[PDB]
């Protein structure tokens, strides 16, 4: 009711940028971010990597910015603000991020069945080099 975040569930390709928004009052202090991966049910304190992660705080608006993502970023995020006049913790509804990969259903099936065929063939080459040298060198 008081703290408001958006969007809710993002699905970006590996490589691009995302942005997240947090709207509440410019009255009692600043906002601190969190981080929480799938395993816990207790969050942590977020690191801000120099360059790769950024943050701004405009008039009635503040924003986490993240460039250059990869698979170790599957987080569920939180902007958090405890009151400075009543001392009450207020906390939003988070966001989620899940980072996709390049290929499609066409090339994935072809390379899977293809390279399965390749490893079948070269394992048959191990069959040739496990039958021929022992039988031949043992005469």
């Amino acid at each position: 009711s008081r703290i408001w975040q958006s969007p809710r569930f993002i699905a970006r390709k590996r490589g691009f940028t995302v942005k997240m928004h947090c709207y509440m009052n410019s009255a009692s202090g600043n906002v601190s971010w969190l981080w929480k991966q799938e395993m816990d049910e207790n969050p942590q304190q977020l690191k801000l990597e120099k360059g790769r992660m950024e943050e701004s705080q405009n008039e009635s608006l503040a924003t986490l910015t993240i460039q250059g993502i990869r698979f170790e970023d599957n987080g569920i995020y939180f902007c958090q603000q405890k009151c400075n006049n009543t001392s009450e913790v207020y906390q939003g509804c988070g966001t989620e991020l899940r980072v996709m990969g390049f290929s499609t259903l066409a090339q994935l099936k072809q390379r899977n069945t293809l390279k399965d065929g390749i490893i079948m063939i070269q394992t048959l080459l191990i069959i040739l080099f496990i039958i021929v040298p022992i039988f031949l060198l043992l005469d």
């Binding site: 699905a11 970006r12 698979f71 599957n74 996709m100 290929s103 259903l105």
Partner: peptide, 11 residues
């Protein structure tokens, strides 16, 4: 780019 089908991690 909201495109780019399934399989987050692998490939």
């Amino acid at each position: 780019s909201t495109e780019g089908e399934v399989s987050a991690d692998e490939e």
